[PDB]
Design a protein around this ligand. Structure first.
Ligand SMILES: [Sr+2]
Lengths: 322, 321
């Protein structure tokens, strides 16, 4: 029993149920307001397991001790830590999102700062590394997304918790997000696994960025490694400045669906964005543009894909019929 | 042993080269001298490269070297003489000869060009066979004269023939060498690569000079093959109107040769631009098709820096695309 995988999972399952209840308190008002301020109702907050970590020292820690969980289990679980005068909660006075496995089991939390006088000055904090929680592979929304990424052959990677919430509310039930870190190798590996039918990788990785310089970071990165999934990787960017949560507030659910559906392939986005910052109305600027994008096509390792982009370059700078 | 040893064989060749050099001043050698003077190689040139003439008859050199003390076993071993039906006879006859030497200037064999209409031997050029001293796949004409400046200058100019070597050296291109009888292969290449290092860490530029263009084509096809370390330090130069360096110098003078070598092109640029030269660049769709044939070639370049540099110039070489 003591400190097994399933015991820690029972503790986190217990913790999330408590924090859920705590969102229905008087001091948790600013957490609820944060939610309604960006159009997430009580049905939504419940669907994503949204909770509140209350003030005080050890509200959760005592709760789980009083229902049989020893403190050593809770430390390895990541829910509690050792203070000067005994045990205390890890999370205090924050809006919490439970972070789940693909099966739906809670393995940790992401926690947003609400109050200006809270000692922890970081905007987001997470559960640290545990037997359950692994920063590099864990994804918010993956529990709600799993069935629909396999059926639709599609995963949609967004930046934050409220972006997943907004996407799923607007019918983009394939949206997921890395928690407290960059989206990386083993997040890709896990989505890749879900999108196998037989031994073939089938589907699309649609990255949704916000602020076009964050999108240009991924573009200049797109030729770097072995380019494994580059051919099936796509980009969607909101009307400049905006993110999925904001785009939904202004323009509604349908604007999000259309943002995802009108995604551009990753190489095409990289090449054309580099053509965009150039003068295409003279022979000189024509020439300069090719001088910088022919090398980009040069780096595409897949010869089918390289030829496809090489074919279209002249058309894009204006030298030929598109 | 005493008889048939390496230095004995070298001494035989040196004696044979002196004999043949003297025989170039004879009456019957006029057409050999006329071969040289007809392409502007003076008496100083002929003496510089050790030019000689193999005389008429059967055993003229053999008998000369037998008076000097050499056994027939040794002259057969050195590739100077062979066993005929009524006795020992010379390998070469009635031909203009160039001694082929090691990089230290020791004669290891000869290249013999046909001079007469009624020459029993039809081949335009004949060489010493494989002996203890002469290996066709590692021997090079000019290497004794070019050794120093190939090492110091980190440059070797590979030309096809003996007169091309002579023409290059007379024009001041002192890094010119050539293979003898056969094609320039791996051992010639690895030797020149080594030499240009100057007992150090230097990359040196290898410059191929081709007569026509099928050789240029052949070099172009090979450019991307395998690991491509010394393709990136290789260069190509071609003369106008399908002339060898010798004739280039005849018509257009020494300056043409010095600037043939100066205006040489990297092997990758040569290959790429040779592919572009077969395509119609006059229309916009032809520009695009040209671009489409070239990015695969550029993509074959393994070195990421070269690939990018060639990729950057592709628009210009197609006519702006
Ligand atoms: Sr000729």
């Amino acid at each position: 029993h003591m400190g097994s995988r399933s015991r820690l999972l029972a503790a986190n399952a217990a913790a999330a149920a408590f924090y859920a209840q705590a969102l229905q308190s008087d001091e948790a008002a600013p957490a609820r307001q944060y939610l309604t301020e960006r159009s997430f109702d009580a049905a939504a907050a419940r669907k994503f397991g949204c909770g509140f970590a209350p003030s005080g020292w050890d509200s959760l820690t005592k709760h789980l001790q009083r229902k049989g969980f020893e403190f050593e289990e809770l430390e390895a679980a990541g829910l509690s830590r050792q203070g000067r005068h005994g045990p205390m909660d890890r999370f205090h006075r924050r809006l919490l999102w439970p972070i789940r496995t693909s099966a739906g089991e809670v393995v940790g939390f992401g926690a947003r700062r609400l109050f200006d006088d809270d000692a922890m000055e970081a905007k987001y904090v997470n559960t640290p590394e545990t037997l359950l929680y692994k920063k590099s592979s864990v994804m918010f929304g993956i529990d709600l997304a799993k069935r629909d990424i396999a059926k639709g052959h599609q995963a949609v990677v967004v930046e934050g918790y409220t972006d997943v919430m907004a996407m799923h509310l607007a019918g983009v039930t394939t949206a997921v997000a890395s928690c407290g870190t960059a989206f990386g190798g083993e997040h890709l590996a896990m989505l890749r696994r879900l999108m196998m039918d037989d031994s073939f990788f089938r589907g699309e990785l649609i990255y949704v960025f916000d602020g076009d310089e964050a999108g240009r970071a991924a573009a200049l990165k797109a030729f770097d490694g072995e380019q494994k999934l580059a051919g099936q990787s796509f980009v969607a960017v909101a009307p400049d400045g905006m993110d999925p949560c904001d785009l939904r507030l202004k323009c509604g659910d349908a604007a999000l669906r259309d943002l995802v559906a009108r995604r551009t392939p990753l190489f095409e986005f990289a090449i054309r964005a580099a053509i965009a910052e150039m003068d295409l109305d003279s022979a000189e600027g024509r020439v300069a543009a090719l001088r910088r994008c022919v090398p980009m096509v040069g780096q595409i390792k897949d010869p089918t894909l390289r030829d496809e982009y090489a074919r279209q370059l002249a058309g894009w700078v204006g030298w030929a019929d598109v």
